[PDB]
């Protein structure tokens, strides 16, 4: 098969008599096809930086194995030519420390999977805005992807209303430092929604928030170009982009 870099992966597999899906001795989870009683899904995601050059899955069933075989592409994002090294900054060790606290808070939340669906048929777009900024939008020093977009930017004066895309319980919401006024949503499934720089969160940690139902303001907090709304998926464990996933996803969960 061939998957983009950056992209997910959705994962049609026969039910009965399966054991397990793997990738080397990490295991990926499976749930249930909801139109076809026969088959499960298991999603797949190739991280932006470094994927690797191909990946070998394996369906463990009880009298086989299925191996899986895909092929990673480069597809084709828009990337500028850095000047400067990104050389190792020096930050204030207070940034540091925020910066290294949030980031064990985020990996804590983004590793803790939800093994039923949150969700309520298809995801929505968040507004009702269009794309200033794409998905993947890469900064590459001598033919090697130094930092990338990792997810997409819709215009939005501040103060825009913003909607969950789909229904979930809040995991985050609060000012973080890179991302600002963050909300994050689990769906389940290890499918998580984001939602940057509000000027105002109208949700709290822990919260039942149905598809549709404000979560807050758009702002330009943490964000140094301007005001806009910054929407992100995460994926099978990774930043994924947004638009091709709400695409693979509905095609399944339609209603
Ligand atoms: N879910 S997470 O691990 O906490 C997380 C993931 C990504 C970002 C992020 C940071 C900066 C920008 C730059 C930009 O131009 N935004 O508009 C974009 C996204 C922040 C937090
Ligand atoms: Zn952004």
Same mark, same amino acid.
């Given at each position: ?6 992209? /997910? ?11 397990? =899906? ?5 295991? &990926?989870?499976?749930? *249930? ?8 899904? /298991? &999603?797949?995601? =190739? ?17 086989? +194995? ?15 030519? =850095? ?14 420390? @925020? ?8 990996? *804590? ?39 990338? %977009?990792?997810?997409?930017?819709? @215009?939005?004066?501040? !103060? ?12 985050? /919401?609060?000012? @973080? ?10 769906? !389940?499934?290890? &499918?998580?929604?984001?939602?940057? %720089? ?7 940690? #822990? ?8 979560? #807050? =303001?758009?702002?330009?907090? #943490? @964000? ?10 995460? *994926? !099978?464990? +990774? ?11 509905? *095609? &399944?969960?339609?209603?």
């Amino acid at each position: 098969m061939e998957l983009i870099k950056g992209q /997910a992966l959705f994962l049609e597999l026969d039910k009965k008599d399966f054991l397990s =899906l793997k990738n080397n001795d990490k295991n &990926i989870p499976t749930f *249930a096809h909801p139109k076809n009683q026969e088959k499960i899904l /298991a &999603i797949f995601s =190739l991280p932006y930086k470094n994927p690797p050059q191909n990946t070998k899955l394996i369906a463990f069933y009880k009298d086989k +194995k299925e191996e899986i075989f895909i092929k990673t592409l480069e597809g084709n994002y828009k990337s500028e030519k =850095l000047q400067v090294e990104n050389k190792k900054i020096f930050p204030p060790k207070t940034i540091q420390e @925020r910066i290294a606290k949030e980031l064990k808070e985020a990996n *804590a939340i983004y590793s803790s999977y939800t093994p039923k669906a949150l969700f309520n048929g298809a995801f929505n777009i968040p507004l009702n805005s269009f794309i200033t900024s794409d998905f993947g939008k890469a900064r590459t020093f001598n033919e090697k992807v130094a930092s990338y %977009h990792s997810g997409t930017d819709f @215009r939005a004066a501040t !103060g825009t209303p913003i909607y969950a895309a789909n229904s979930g319980v809040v995991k985050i /919401a609060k000012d @973080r430092y890179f991302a600002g006024n963050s909300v994050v949503i689990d769906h !389940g499934f290890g &499918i998580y929604s984001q939602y940057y %720089h509000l000027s105002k969160i109208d949700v709290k940690v #822990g919260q039942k928030i149905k598809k549709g139902e404000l979560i #807050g =303001l758009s702002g330009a907090s #943490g @964000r140094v170009s301007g005001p806009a709304l910054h929407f992100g998926i995460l *994926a !099978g464990g +990774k930043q994924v982009d947004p638009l091709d996933f709400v695409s693979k996803f509905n *095609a &399944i969960f339609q209603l």
